[PDB]
Design a protein around this ligand. Structure first.
Ligand SMILES: [Mg+2]
Lengths: 196, 236, 873, 49
């Protein structure tokens, strides 16, 4: 009956595939995703979960409202059965914009707001340049949380290095390639600032 | 790759029809949430004086408060050659918008077909293209109408479907024409009027820094110059 | 609901400012109920309790449980269930659930097939609450009845994955040694025998072929033999029974295998589990290296076997007056003759033609009988080969065999003697390699611990041609080929049934016939052509027992220390593992004495450690869980005694089509079925094909045999409930809200006014005030609020007010005038006289509000007599 | 630019022979399938074979 925060977190892309191979364009897979919540903001009544589902490349996804969970739960497994298929365009309307109106009314349980200023908080070019000078960027050789793939051994004729059972953080960077890097900042609401 | 001809010793009948079948979707980026750089020195406006946003009807169920969720998806802009939206008010199931040189009726949730003998925010309906309030705080809502004081026209109006200049009718043109200023109302130093309403006795007080003109709806006549000046608030 | 005011227009009722009366249970009483619950597991059954439809006087009885209720369901013995209990009001409204705890079942299913009937026992939980204080509190809450309510486990938090028989596998000598197949699935189901009295049966005239043949089930026993005393057991024609053990000082592995590279050995170290879940639940056909543990829980009471045989030859018989295909009697017996259980139709004298002599005489009306094996030579059924004038005689075109072992009952082990593959701290009892589901093709079994071998390679769809390479290593006579076995004498008096029966005794090779030392050519007495091995299998689970810490093989145990493995001689190593310890084999024994017939070791694959079973044992996970009803509603007297009748586990007959034909035109095909009773979460008796319990079983296939209708495996999902938190604040007060009922039909049905659904609600503005009163005047409803007065548009004609029963939006008359004391309202022909204390007036609404106090001069009288307290008598 | 190498360890080989006419020898064996390179990764010496 109250407020709503912006999207403060988005999980990495997760692969709906089989434990040993991929899935054809027309096959349904028997998978389930375990969501482990840790140190949630108990002041809120509920925490909501969405799921952006892509069946092709750069296609209109299928957003589903998984559940409206209590904020004190510590685990939820998302079977694909439950969930309402919401419009993908209302993931931009979560929380909404921040405005400075001047007068209000109230009719038919609806609110009007007139003569409003859209409060956009920007970063000064001086601070942007200071951030771009103060950045000590380096390349490191990191890995995944597991870091040991015991599924593969030299006691086999063939082991398929399968990396779809993990997150989309399997991706790395080509050694001789140029990448245009940046950094963002988050407000107290979950609104991400521009890039520096 | 979604074919099962992987890691087998036979590999006798394999072919590009069976062996390297591919599902491109897994090669997807984080394209949904994407951003870009902005130029600080660039002038992109953020002020809309002639603009009205509309939220969703409150579900009054166990979900978010629609009022706090502003999407700017049902906007409505009034004429800009009258003036900024000084005040928006509702009287008898209808919203009426005061502008600096205008007064309109925002059609919203009017039944589709006839006014009288579907929640979509239809266009505005202008009542007066030249009369409009300039100090929001001289507006007092009452059963009879909306008492507002227009400094530009030097009058004390009452809207009850039709605009009525109470100052002219009851003879107060000079008093208002001599006590008008451009500076808006603010609590520290009274400069313009500040209208209240006594719901218990149908009395309307148009307060000023050195006087308090009282008006009674019981007789539709001004009563006195009360000694209630310089009071920030008077409410029921 | 607890409304505050009402109206009545167009036979419709309005109700405003209502509070939703939700009666909850306190956490203290919930915890007291969860402490006072004495839950136990009982062995109950159905009201009938005697299934006279099933008897041991039949070749097959299908235990069909769809003519009964859904209370046939029970509970898996080693499974965890989150239990609960509900209560019913005087109206039939069921309360929330009271979580009483996670409890493990302790009783298994039990089916006992007596002579004329069978009794199935269904495990059921039973909650007992006898604390009279808690019962009296529950009654004081208005409750009368109670019911069982459960959350069943998902496939991820299950302890037991599935339950099914264990089938030994087979492996060709060459191919173990080239690892191209290593181990491979058997044509035939190889059950263990309960005793060793069958070894003496295969000696002399003791074995009558009408009993059936016990397959080669010993661990490393070659599938074949040279002893004519057990000739009916021979499953392959190019087999010579070369043991899979060699002395490394004498010969290499290759040179040893080259004496019989087309020989097969059994393998109980690598088994093939067959459960109904894998075949019917497609989620278990995709497992890839599943870390599970194995435990053997029981046996199968094999009693009979339904066998068949068919022989079709491309060319006619050699003898012009010959008989040809002769069909004998093999194992087609009822359940009562249970001694000959786990027995098959493997080999026999299924052919009868004249002899191919050097001086040909097809004109004779005499007849020998010839051996016909499952995987037979790619040539003539009688003695011929390399025809010198054209085609062969009696050449094979298509042969096929069916078998249906029927397990009339399962005897389960005592809890003490249950066999666990992995026993911590036991060197011998190592665990199980990761489970693998075979569906269509290749399955690399992972490496087995404490073995220097690699990851094994497995196939169940075999398309092989077996060739007999001729050598003198096993015996001198094999430099010409494999011998041809026929009867000692001709069919003497038409007695071809007795001669067929006594094939163990009346059988001798063609060359050893002392009368035929010069009358038969060398090419018409030795067989030197391949054998076409072709068979397919169905979905199943394959795994392997890990080697012991000493390097030996862990093996299925032997009942009562009977029918053990083939022990290797001194200093002899397996041909697939030269660097093996002495003996190279370890097999334990289960001392089970309630089983006296052949059986399959009935096991369950289980997951020992399961974290966060139902999401958690905390109150949150229980709040996030979905519950289901279980049991009939009982009255609450001096004690609450609930019985959870409906669970999630069945106990039904499962016919596993282990093997079928690769094609419908191949020469040698095999069909093998194992009909036994098993536990499942899928309704096995929803099978809708009529190829059940028939002896033919020749053309059966996964296209015909195990067709399934999933709908019968449905839960009580329609009426589902969940837990609620007492301390949670969910509102039940709606001051600005108006419900609308349906127009009264005024016919013989319910009163629509009493049926409130909250489906046509309407909420007024909340910044004026609560709905003090609702009134109707001249066909229009008008709502008084504490600082407002509106007109509820309802049943106004669609288009014009004046010169369709849907509750349209409100129409406000005054945004500041509204009544605060409902009881000052009086309806009259002229309007609505109400007294507003806030405005200090006495109004009259007649389309337009009129202040009578001001008009007639009563402002002071009302302004002096007003108060905030509402009216009360 | 050549940046690295590949650690070849094993090779999965197969063979199939189908003849239109039968063997010349009436008692001949025909197609014989031998063992070639079907080994695990551990025996890495016989790589690229
Ligand atoms: Mg032991």
């Amino acid at each position: 009956y109250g407020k709503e925060t912006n999207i403060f977190r988005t999980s990495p892309l997760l692969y709906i595939a089989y434990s040993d191979r991929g899935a054809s364009p027309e096959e349904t897979v028997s998978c389930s995703f375990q969501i482990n919540f840790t140190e949630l903001d108990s002041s809120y009544d509920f925490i909501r979960v969405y799921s952006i589902h892509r069946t092709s490349i750069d296609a209109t996804p299928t957003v589903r409202k998984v559940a409206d969970l209590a904020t004190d739960t510590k685990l939820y497994v998302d079977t694909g059965t439950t969930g309402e298929i919401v419009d993908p365009t209302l993931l931009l309307y979560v929380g909404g914009e921040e405005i400075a109106p001047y007068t209000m009314t109230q009719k038919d349980n609806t609110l009007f707001l007139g003569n409003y200023t859209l409060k956009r908080s920007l970063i000064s070019t001086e601070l942007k340049n200071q951030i771009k000078s103060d950045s000590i960027v380096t390349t490191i050789l990191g890995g995944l949380d597991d870091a040991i793939e015991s599924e593969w051994n030299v006691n086999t004729q063939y082991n398929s290095n399968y990396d779809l059972n993990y997150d989309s953080r399997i991706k790395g960077f080509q050694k001789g390639e140029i990448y245009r890097l940046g950094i963002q900042f988050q407000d107290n609401k979950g609104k991400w600032s521009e890039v520096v | 790759r979604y074919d099962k001809n992987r890691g087998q010793v036979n590999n006798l009948a394999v072919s590009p029809t069976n062996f390297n079948l591919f599902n491109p979707v897994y090669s997807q980026k984080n394209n949904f949430f994407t951003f870009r750089t902005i130029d600080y020195e660039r002038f992109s406006i953020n002020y809309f004086p002639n603009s009205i946003t509309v939220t969703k009807e409150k579900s009054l169920g166990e979900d978010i408060d629609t009022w706090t969720n502003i999407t700017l998806a049902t906007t409505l802009d009034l004429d800009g050659d009258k003036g900024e939206i000084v005040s928006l008010n509702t009287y008898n199931n209808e919203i009426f918008c005061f502008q600096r040189r205008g007064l309109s009726n925002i059609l919203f949730n009017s039944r589709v077909q006839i006014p009288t003998s579907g929640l979509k925010v239809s266009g505005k309906r202008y009542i007066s293209n030249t009369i409009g309030c300039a100090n929001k705080w001289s507006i007092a809502e009452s059963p009879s109408g909306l008492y507002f004081i227009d400094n530009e026209t030097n009058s004390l109006y009452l809207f009850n479907g039709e605009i009525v200049s109470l100052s002219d009718k009851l003879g107060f043109r000079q008093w208002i024409s001599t006590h008008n200023v451009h500076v808006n109302w603010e609590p520290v130093g009274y400069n313009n009027y500040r209208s209240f309403y006594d719901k218990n006795n149908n009395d309307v007080y148009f307060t000023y820094k050195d006087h308090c003109l009282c008006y009674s709806e019981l007789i539709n006549q001004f009563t006195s110059f009360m000694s209630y000046e310089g009071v920030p608030a008077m409410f029921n | 609901i607890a409304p505050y005011t009402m109206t009545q227009k167009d036979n419709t009722l309005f109700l405003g400012n209502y509070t939703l009366k939700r009666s909850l249970i306190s956490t203290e009483l919930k915890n007291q109920i969860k402490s006072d619950s004495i839950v136990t597991t009982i062995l109950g059954g159905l009201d009938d309790a005697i299934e006279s439809e099933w008897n041991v006087n039949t070749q097959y009885n299908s235990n069909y449980d769809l003519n009964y209720d859904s209370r046939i369901k029970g509970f898996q013995k080693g499974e965890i269930y989150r239990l609960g209990i509900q209560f019913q009001d005087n109206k039939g409204k069921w309360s929330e659930v009271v979580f009483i705890g996670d409890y493990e079942c302790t009783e298994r299913f039990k089916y006992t097939q007596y002579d004329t009937y069978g009794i199935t026992l269904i495990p059921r939980f039973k909650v007992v609450i006898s604390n009279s204080t808690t019962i009296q509190a529950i009654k004081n809450l208005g409750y009368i009845n109670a019911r069982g309510v459960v959350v069943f486990p998902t496939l991820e938090d299950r302890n037991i994955l599935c339950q099914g028989i264990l089938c030994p596998t087979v492996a060709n000598y060459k191919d173990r040694l080239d690892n191209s197949p290593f181990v491979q699935s058997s044509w035939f189901s190889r059950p263990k025998q309960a005793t060793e009295t069958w070894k003496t049966e295969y000696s002399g005239t003791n074995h009558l072929s009408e009993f059936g043949e016990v397959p080669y089930f010993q661990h490393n026993e070659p599938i074949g033999s040279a002893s004519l005393s057990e000739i009916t057991r021979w499953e392959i024609q190019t087999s010579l029974g070369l043991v899979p053990y060699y002395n490394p000082s004498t010969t290499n592995a290759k040179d040893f295998v080259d004496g019989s590279p087309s020989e097969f050995l059994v393998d109980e170290n690598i088994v093939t589990m067959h459960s109904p879940d894998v075949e019917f639940d497609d989620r278990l056909q995709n497992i890839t290296n599943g870390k599970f543990k194995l435990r053997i829980i029981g046996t199968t009471h094999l009693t009979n076997t339904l066998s068949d045989i068919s022989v079709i030859t491309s060319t006619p018989t050699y003898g012009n007056y010959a008989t040809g295909f002769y069909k004998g009697k093999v194992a087609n017996m009822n359940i009562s003759t249970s001694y000959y259980g786990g027995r098959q139709l493997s080999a026999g004298l299924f052919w009868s033609d004249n002899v191919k002599f050097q001086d040909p005489s097809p004109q004779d009306k005499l007849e020998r009988l010839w051996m016909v094996y499952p995987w037979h030579r790619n040539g003539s059924l009688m003695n011929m080969g390399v025809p010198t004038e054209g085609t062969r005689a009696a050449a094979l075109q298509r042969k096929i065999i069916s078998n249906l072992k029927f397990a009339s009952q399962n005897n389960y082990l005592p809890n003490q003697s249950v066999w666990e593959a992995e026993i911590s701290g036991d060197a011998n009892h190592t665990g199980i390699t990761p489970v693998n589901s075979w569906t269509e093709g290749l399955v690399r079994i992972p490496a087995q611990a404490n073995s220097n071998l690699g990851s094994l390679n497995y196939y169940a769809n075999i398309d092989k041609v077996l060739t007999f390479n001729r050598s003198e290593q096993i015996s001198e006579i094999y430099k010409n080929g494999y011998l041809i076995y026929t009867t000692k004498d001709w069919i003497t008096d038409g007695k071809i049934a007795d001669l067929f029966n006594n094939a163990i005794s009346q059988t001798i090779s063609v060359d050893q016939v002392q009368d035929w030392l010069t009358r038969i050519a060398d090419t018409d007495k030795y067989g030197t052509e391949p054998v076409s091995m072709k068979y397919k299998s169905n979905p199943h689970l394959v795994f392997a027992f890990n080697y012991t810490e000493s390097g030996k093989q862990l093996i299925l145990p032997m009942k009562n220390n009977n029918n053990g493995y083939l022990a290797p001689s001194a200093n002899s190593k397996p041909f697939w593992n030269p660097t093996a310890p002495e003996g190279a084999v370890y097999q334990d024994s289960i001392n089970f004495t309630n089983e006296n017939r052949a059986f399959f070791w009935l096991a369950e694959l289980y997951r020992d450690s399961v974290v966060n079973r139902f999401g958690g044992d905390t109150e949150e996970a229980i709040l996030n869980n979905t519950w289901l009803p279980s049991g009939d509603s009982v009255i609450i007297g001096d004690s609450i005694n609930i019985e959870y009748t409906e669970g999630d586990t069945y106990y039904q007959r499962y016919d596993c089509l282990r093997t079928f034909a690769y094609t419908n035109e191949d020469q040698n095909s095999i069909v093998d079925i194992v009909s036994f009773m098993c536990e499942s979460k899928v309704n096995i008796d929803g099978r809708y094909d009529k190829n059940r319990g028939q002896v033919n079983n020749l053309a059966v296939s996964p296209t015909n045999f195990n067709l399934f209708n999933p709908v019968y495996s449905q839960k009580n999902n329609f009426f589902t409930f969940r837990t609620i938190d007492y301390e949670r604040f969910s509102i039940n007060y709606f001051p600005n809200s108006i419900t609308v009922t349906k127009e009264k039909s005024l016919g013989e049905d319910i009163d629509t006014w009493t049926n409130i659904t909250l489906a046509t609600t309407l909420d007024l503005d909340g910044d004026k005030g609560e709905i003090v009163s609702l009134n109707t005047y001249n066909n229009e409803i008008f709502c008084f609020q504490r600082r407002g007065l509106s007109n509820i548009l309802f049943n106004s004609r669609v288009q014009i007010p004046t010169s369709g029963l849907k509750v349209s939006g409100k129409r406000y008359i005054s945004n500041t005038i509204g009544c605060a004391n409902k009881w000052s309202i009086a309806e009259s022909p002229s309007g609505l006289y109400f007294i507003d204390n806030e405005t200090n007036s006495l109004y009259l609404f007649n389309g337009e509000i009129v202040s009578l106090s001001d008009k007639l001069g009563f402002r002071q009288w009302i302004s002096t007599h007003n108060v905030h307290v509402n009216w009360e008598p």
